Amino acid sequence: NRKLNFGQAVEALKKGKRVARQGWNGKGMFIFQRPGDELSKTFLPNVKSLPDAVKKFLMDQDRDIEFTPYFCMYSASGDIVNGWLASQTDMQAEDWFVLED
Amino acid sequence: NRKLNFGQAVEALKKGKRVARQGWNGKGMFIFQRPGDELSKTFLPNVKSLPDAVKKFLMDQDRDIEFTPYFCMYSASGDIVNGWLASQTDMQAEDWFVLED
Amino acid sequence: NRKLNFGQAVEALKKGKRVARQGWNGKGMFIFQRPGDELSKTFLPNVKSLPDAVKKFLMDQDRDIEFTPYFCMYSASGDIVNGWLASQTDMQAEDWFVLED
Amino acid sequence: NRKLNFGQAVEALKKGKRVARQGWNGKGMFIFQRPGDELSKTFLPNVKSLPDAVKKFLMDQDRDIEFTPYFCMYSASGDIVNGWLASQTDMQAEDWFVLED
Ligand SMILES: Nc1nc2c(ncn2[C@@H]2O[C@@H]3COP(=O)(O)O[C@H]4[C@@H](O)[C@H](n5cnc6c(=O)[nH]c(N)nc65)O[C@@H]4COP(=O)(O)O[C@H]3[C@H]2O)c(=O)[nH]1
Ligand SMILES: Nc1nc2c(ncn2[C@@H]2O[C@@H]3COP(=O)(O)O[C@H]4[C@@H](O)[C@H](n5cnc6c(=O)[nH]c(N)nc65)O[C@@H]4COP(=O)(O)O[C@H]3[C@H]2O)c(=O)[nH]1
């Protein structure tokens, strides 16, 4: 399950798998995807994790709001880093692998 | 509150403000920051928005988990895009502004 | 040659092909890859496109320097944008296609 | 010249300075900007570093072509990585500094 390209890593991420690069050397890091959802207008007022300016703007829309899926990283520090992005090096790399489990 | 550089936009984003580029022409788009949080190990099992493989891995850690703040975009489509990233063009741009409210 | 995923776009980019997303609507934009090269230490002093601080640092290395391949965009404005990066939306998109030629 | 925010790092990069994060621990890495240029249509055929499909497309334009400035990284491996991008962590970090020289 190794020597994968970025595209293969991405297809595994969309399947809820965890992936990593060999070149990230034994630091326990991996990437994963968090699913999207559509939040009903009725539910939206209960969301804690939006700035008030944004929450007000969206409630004024008075409609259900779609939140997109996105990639996240479990860092060398053991934090969940929201919104992981692929460097040029990562996108072109041939050393990706799928973590077991 | 216009003709700002990316750095100024970023400092406004950390203040929970919404920011945008003039060069994004009247499509209603803006960037905002979602706050970080530390989730107690006791709370973590209740999280819906993590893949099961990741949720299991983290619960096995048996510790509180930090989730980082991250930038998000309200898109031209009216979706909340999690994990917005700055293109070269955005990082070097001098046409940022802070949205009122 | 359509309805491609990002991974397929990336494999085409590594083949020197030009690729684009349907969702970028008829603005003539495409992505391409610029090749890497290793520049001999003897050649390096002739490079115009490096800041002097960086050029001095590298010449002091007194060794050949590898420059990585990277993705670039031909923009809606008709500029070559060096160092194009894939948004969350792009990485997860299923509407990529290879441009003819 | 330390404890800088990303915006301050970016303003230094536009001045042709080299910048880095404390959290990148003594691996010699830094970021720098490569200048943009406008290449005359007459010069463009001589460019080695463009795929043939792209070079042909641009020459058919029969006009001068602008190439944008972009950020680059001198990596832990000692390679010049073209098209460096700022992670969420980097954009929000308060540990940037300007390298001397
Ligand atoms: N700062 C921070 N806190 C986090 C993070 N992940 C989880 N939490 C906290 O855990 C609570 C429950 O998360 P949930 O079960 O996914 O429950 C979430 C989830 O089901 C949904 N939701 C909110 N935003 C999104 C989103 O962007 N995508 C998806 N798919 N669902 C979302 O709304 C529910 C309630 O959201 P909240 O009120 O924010 O309530 C969240 C928030 O307080 C994170 O990355 N950062
Ligand atoms: N600002 C700017 N100018 C551009 C750009 N593309 C081409 N040029 C200009 O065109 C000259 C010739 O480019 P080349 O044929 O690729 O000739 C290049 C190429 O063969 C090589 N080289 C330099 N940097 C790189 C790199 O990052 N990657 C690769 N593969 N080759 C490089 O060194 C040769 C001489 O480089 P320069 O002295 O810089 O000379 C460059 C530079 O003045 C661009 O995106 N931005």
Q: How many CA atoms lie within 13 A of A72 on its CB side?
A: 27
Q: Which of C29, C26, C31 is nearest to C12 (CA)?
A: C31
Amino acid at position C65, single letter: I
Q: Which of B32, B1, B2 is nearest to B14 (CA)?
A: B32
Choice from A39, A44, A49, A71 to test ligand 1 binding pocket (greatest atom count within 8 A of CB): A49
Mutation choice for A interface testing from C91, C94, C98 by most A CBs within 10 A: C91
Q: Identify whether the C-beta of residue B96 lies closer than 8 Å to the C-beta of residue B7.
A: no
Q: How many helices (H) and strands (E) does chain C have?
A: 3, 7
CA separation for the pair A68, C91 (Å, rounded): 12
N-term to C-term CA, chain C: 12
Q: Identify whether the C-beta of residue D41 lies closer than 8 Å to the C-beta of residue D64.
A: yes
Q: Identify whether the C-beta of residue D54 lies closer than 8 Å to the C-beta of residue C74.
A: yes
Residue A74 forms beta bridges with which residues?
Answer: A30, A80
DSSP state letters, C15-61: TT--EEETTS-SS--EEEEEPPEEE-TTTGGG-SSS-HHHHHHHHHH
Q: Is the dihedral of CA C21, C24, C30, C33 positive or negative?
A: negative
Q: Token pair 């936009």 is at which residue?
A: B9
Chains that touch D (3 or more CB pairs under 8 A): A, B, C
CA separation for the pair A96, B10 (Å, rounded): 32
B32/D contact by beta carbon, under 8 A: no
Q: What is the DSSP letter of A51?
A: -
CA separation for the pair D87, B85 (Å, rounded): 8
How close is the Cα of C95 to the center of ligand 2, in Å? Answer: 32
Residue of chain B minimizing CA distance to C87:
B85
CA separation for the pair A100, A17 (Å, rounded): 9
Residues contacting C55, CB < 8 A, separation 6+: C44, C45, C47
Q: Which ligand is nearest to the CA of C58?
A: 2
Burial level of A31, CB count in 10 A (0-12/13-18/19+)? buried
Long-range contacts of D44-49 (CB under 8 A, 24+ apart): D49/C34, D49/C35, D49/C37
Q: Which two tokens stand for residue A99?
A: 């973590």
H-only helix segments in chain B:
6-13, 52-61, 88-92
- Identify the three-state secondary structure at position D27: coil
State the DSSP H helix or E strand holding residue B67, giving kind and residue range, or none if neither. strand B65-67
Q: What is the DSSP letter of D39?
A: E
Residue B98 forms beta bridges with which residues?
Answer: B19
How close is the Cα of C12 to the center of ligand 2, in Å? Answer: 23
* Phi, psi (degrees; rounded to nearest 5) at A20: -155, 165
Q: Which two tokens stand for residue B1?
A: 């509150």
Residues contacting C38, CB < 8 A, separation 6+: C64, C65, C66, C67
Of C7, C68, C88, which has the smallest distance from its Cβ to A8's Cβ? C7
H-only helix segments in D1-101:
6-13, 52-61, 88-92
Burial level of A83, CB count in 10 A (0-12/13-18/19+)? buried
**Is B36 touching ligand 1 by the criterion CB < 6 Å?**
yes
* Phi, psi (degrees; rounded to nearest 5) at D45: -60, -20
- Strand B96-98 with B19-21, pairing: antiparallel
Q: D-chain residues within 8 Å CB-CB of A84?
A: 87-88
State the DSSP H helix or E strand holding residue A97, giving kind and residue range, or none if neither. strand A96-98
Q: D-chain residues within 8 Å CB-CB of A88?
A: 81-85
Closest ligand 2 atom, residue C48 Cα: 38
CA separation for the pair C31, D51 (Å, rounded): 11
Q: Which of B101, B100, B90 is nearest to B10 (CA)?
A: B90
What does each C-alpha distance from C97 to A94, C2, C8, C12, C23 come to in angstroms?
22, 4, 9, 9, 11
How close is the Cα of C84 to the center of ligand 2, in Å? Answer: 17
Q: Which two tokens stand for residue A77?
A: 């520090």
Tell me the structure's resolution in angstroms, rounded to a single decimal.
Answer: 1.7
Annotate B12-29 with three-state secondary structure.
HHCCCCCEEECCCCCCCC
Residues contacting D47, CB < 8 A, separation 6+: D39, D55
Q: Are residues D68 and C80, on separate chains, in Cβ contact within 8 Å?
A: yes
Chain A contacts in chain C segment 43-72 (CB below 8 A): 68-71
Closest ligand 2 atom, residue C34 Cα: 30
CA separation for the pair A11, A5 (Å, rounded): 10
**Is C48 touching ligand 2 by the criterion CB < 6 Å?**
yes
CA separation for the pair A40, C30 (Å, rounded): 36
Residues contacting D31, CB < 8 A, separation 6+: D9, D13, D18, D19, D20, D71, D72, D73, D74, D84
Closest ligand 2 atom, residue C80 Cα: 45
Q: D-chain residues within 8 Å CB-CB of C67?
A: 79-80, 82
State the DSSP H helix or E strand holding residue A88, giving kind and residue range, or none if neither. helix A88-92
Residues contacting D53, CB < 8 A, separation 6+: C16, C17, C18, C32, C99, C101
- Domain assignments of chain A as residue spans, ordered by start: 6-98
**Is A67 touching ligand 1 by the criterion CB < 6 Å?**
yes
Q: How many CA atoms lie within 13 A of D82 on its CB side?
A: 26
Provide the CA A84 distance to its chain's centre, in angstroms: 6
Q: Which of C28, C22, C16 is nearest to C2 (CA)?
A: C22
Q: Are residues A53 and B84, on separate chains, in Cβ contact within 8 Å?
A: no
Residue C32 forms beta bridges with which residues?
Answer: C72
CA separation for the pair A82, B69 (Å, rounded): 7
How close D8 comes to chain A (CA, Å)?
A: 22
